[PDB]
Symmetry: C3
Subunit: 391 residues, 3 copies
């Protein structure tokens, strides 16, 4: 099977798995001390829950026999009939789902019942993630329309980003969100998370070529390029508005990483530079706007991943370079690829937001998403885990 | 030599090396602030000491010319006559030894002299680890009886687990262990360690196939499966007894990882599910029991690794699937494989505990294992390292 | 292109990238709480700035058309004409530059303007790093004289080490540096950085063979060997002078890693043992000496990397083993290789120090390197980033 290709994907799988707790640390540092354990714990639970549902039926529903082009069958339930390289693909994809669910916890920071999060996550993975993966990567209707998504601009970033906006609107603002600002309890912990996310993204984008080839190498080059450019943009914006906070710098880098994800294997370094530059700008504007609208989409999964994934996914249809990986976008003579991307971006953006809204409200009505006021006050570490982060 | 296979093992080696300080962080977060540096430092010392002894003679004593089937000769001392792929195997195995020694520090948490730990570790590596590795992986008597151990269920987990129980009983309870409970100074630091251990285990179990092949891929699938199931079990037990603490969740995942280690390359996903489920249950019962017996085996190396490695090693003889890697267990028609495992588990469990007990007491008599009461009071960071963790 | 070789280098690239924030954490734990974010932020900025300059022209100036043997042309600007494996080489080398710049931040700990650091870094990368890389690795004059540098003993360690000494002397001592000692705010954070640096060094030295072969395997064996020996030396020195602090242990390991870097692919285990042992000793003496001279080269980039890289680079000419990788040093009959190393070490050491001194003073005159006294007092987290590390 080419030991080298299996070697690279085995490693890329480990790298993406690390990104799950990586998201947890990234977010934990931005919430209050009394919620530090909860924020981290949520990412580990996201991993555990995803592994189980994925092998049980999540993998099958995503990449199984296509039915009407919107979802897969159950022929791969419990991995029945999944062997050889399919098992490695299954494993690799499993981690994309896990990271997606973790990114989503941004919207429930500091005020959700763990049990309700588990319920909603299982429903979301089933009715939003699996479908998306199938549409684009499982021979679904979007792939048929000619839409592309190299590493998850829509499957992972738009889905979690817009799903996060809907959840934030359903669960409500944290107490004191509008009156007083919430200070990050540990920026260093967040920076450790940021380091693990940049590192693991080598496997996220670089492993999506499913081989140690020229496409993987290109994906690694443009991924670092877009991250650097977008991170630089936020640094400049920071100086323009005051001082360059470290949170802004890494948030900018992640915007660049999310935007380049859908295009990593189709664009050149110059295209990567444009994607990162625009990503840095549009994502910053999105953050300021949701803040102005007073929406407590806490850790900006929407502004960074949602908007970052949206731009990047559209950018594919504009900048795809034929000399890089065969596909050509608008600027390279093919207006058709741009239309496929817009259809894909429009579909996934609307479904993610609207279906998540339905799922959130449903769970809220069935069991209640938010913790009591007193638990929010004492913190979820004590309330939901009976633990104290630091002594 | 197949660049792909060397690529995967070179990477798996780096991954296992990371697990050494990973254990240090995992444990450091569970002890008091005044002992944080000591707990971490012990894992780095474990690495440094292991590298030196291994190249000097540890590697040879483990995989050198067999003498009577219980130990290897000195033909590989100072790596004399070790080249090519043997050097990569030597390097990879070196890290398993290091992680094993680090896991063991669980038993001396907060009250051991660093010098004595170094002395005991060198003796243990020599008279317990090297022998075990040789018996099972160096063509020793256990391998001859037909016993199997894919990634270290006995060599690494039973050995450190039961060695930890003996050391805990020899060194004694921490001051105030029985009167008052010791609070973890930093659960987030422990969660960072847990993230690094799960990540590195991709190289631990996945690299034991010694190639980027279908066995490695299978090992990676079942390893994540068992971890998820056992982690889920502890989460449920947590809710049943109160709230799901994050420590319980990751401790459960590690139980699953330790239990699947001896079987990662021989069982299927369904077998992995049973191993993880039982691992979660038996390891939790073991923790409650050693606690009830008031044994201060501090960070539960015994309950998690000892008992987890024991079950998993026996499970190999029950669930090994011929279609996975040729070997068949009791449930697949071969009762012979189960008997080989029981003999191997019975031998390694008794030797680890009894020989470690002799070694611990010997070192205790020769130099004294435990620090003075005043040093235990002020903490080992100041007392043994003249350092203060946080300012 | 051999999927296995691309696999190993793709992974080695991710590993070296992780070392950049790794340096940040390593250093952050050693400075005061009020400067924790600044120290970490500097490493992320080092990464972002390096990625941009490298693709823009840094890569070309280092490995482009040679002009007079001292620098490369601009034929590779914006990666023009860089494809296939050259892109992977470009990516891999990019990270060496980033780590080098991060190591350098040792000299400006707690008192530099971020803007000035960015300016100086861009100038340094242009006039010191690019030249060095070209001289030794880009077919420059030093490579022509027969000088060798396997993974960066001179390109990365001597350059940052001596550049750090010059910068420290230009920017001046931190307030209270001579009167009172600065306590590390978080040794555990530093130990997390040390763990990431040891881990990533598998890709640093092991990936420099540019293939998953016997040279990579050898590099990995001797790299861990030298680290262990030098780390052991500092532990012993620690006990001789009091107690073995964890900072001393990991600082010793890093000295061993820096010293073995230039020789990783040319020496045997016995040579690695000598290099690590001497590295441990000479680097400790260098630290004590710069301290005695009251030079506030804060986090000892000079004593560890500068002196460690110098010894190691010279050691190559003494211990290179023909049976390992063809090259032979003085002890193996070839006095010629030693002379090439001394010329290379003498040139890079003098240029790094003198040119950096010119660059530092120039930037200081143009914009001012040091922050105001009040900003140094309140801390750079607030002053330069308007952030507070912990709440």
């Amino acid at each position: 099977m080419s030991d080298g290709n299996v070697a690279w994907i085995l490693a890329s799988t480990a790298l993406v798995m690390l990104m799950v707790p990586g998201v947890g640390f990234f977010y934990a540092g931005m919430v209050r001390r009394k919620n530090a354990v909860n924020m981290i714990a949520l990412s580990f639970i996201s991993l555990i829950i995803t592994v189980l549902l994925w092998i049980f039926y999540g993998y099958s529903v995503s990449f199984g026999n296509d039915i009407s082009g919107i979802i897969g069958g159950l022929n791969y339930a419990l991995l029945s009939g999944v062997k050889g390289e399919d098992l490695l693909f299954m494993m690799y994809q499993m981690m994309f789902a896990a990271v997606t669910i973790a990114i989503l916890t941004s919207a429930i920071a500091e005020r959700a019942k763990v049990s309700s999060f588990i319920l909603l996550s299982a429903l979301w993975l089933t009715f939003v993630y699996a479908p998306f993966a199938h549409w684009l990567w499982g021979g679904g209707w979007l792939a048929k329309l000619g839409a592309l998504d190299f590493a998850g601009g829509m499957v992972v970033h738009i889905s979690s980003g817009f799903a996060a906006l809907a959840v934030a609107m359903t669960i409500g603002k944290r107490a004191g969100f509008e009156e007083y600002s919430i200070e990050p309890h540990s920026i260093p912990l967040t920076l450790i998370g940021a380091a693990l996310l940049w590192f693991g993204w080598f496997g996220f984008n670089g492993g999506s070529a499913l081989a140690a080839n020229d496409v993987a190498i290109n994906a690694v080059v443009v991924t670092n390029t877009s991250a650097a450019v977008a991170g630089f943009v936020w640094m400049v914006i920071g100086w323009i508005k005051g001082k360059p906070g470290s949170l802004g710098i890494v948030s900018g880098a992640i915007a660049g990483l999310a935007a380049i994800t859908p295009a990593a294997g189709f664009v050149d370094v110059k295209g990567a530079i444009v994607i990162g530059l625009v990503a840095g700008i549009v994502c910053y504007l999105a953050m300021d706007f949701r803040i102005k609208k007073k929406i407590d989409e806490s850790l900006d999964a929407w502004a960074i991943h949602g908007i970052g994934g949206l731009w990047g996914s559209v950018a594919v249809g504009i900048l795809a370079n034929p000399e890089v990986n065969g596909y050509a976008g608008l600027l390279f003579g093919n207006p058709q690829l741009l239309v496929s991307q817009l259809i894909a971006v429009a579909s996934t953006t609307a479904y993610a937001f609207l279906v998540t809204l339905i799922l959130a409200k449903a769970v809220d009505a069935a069991v209640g998403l938010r913790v009591s006021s007193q638990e929010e006050y004492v913190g979820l570490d004590l309330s939901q885990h009976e633990e104290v982060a630091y002594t």
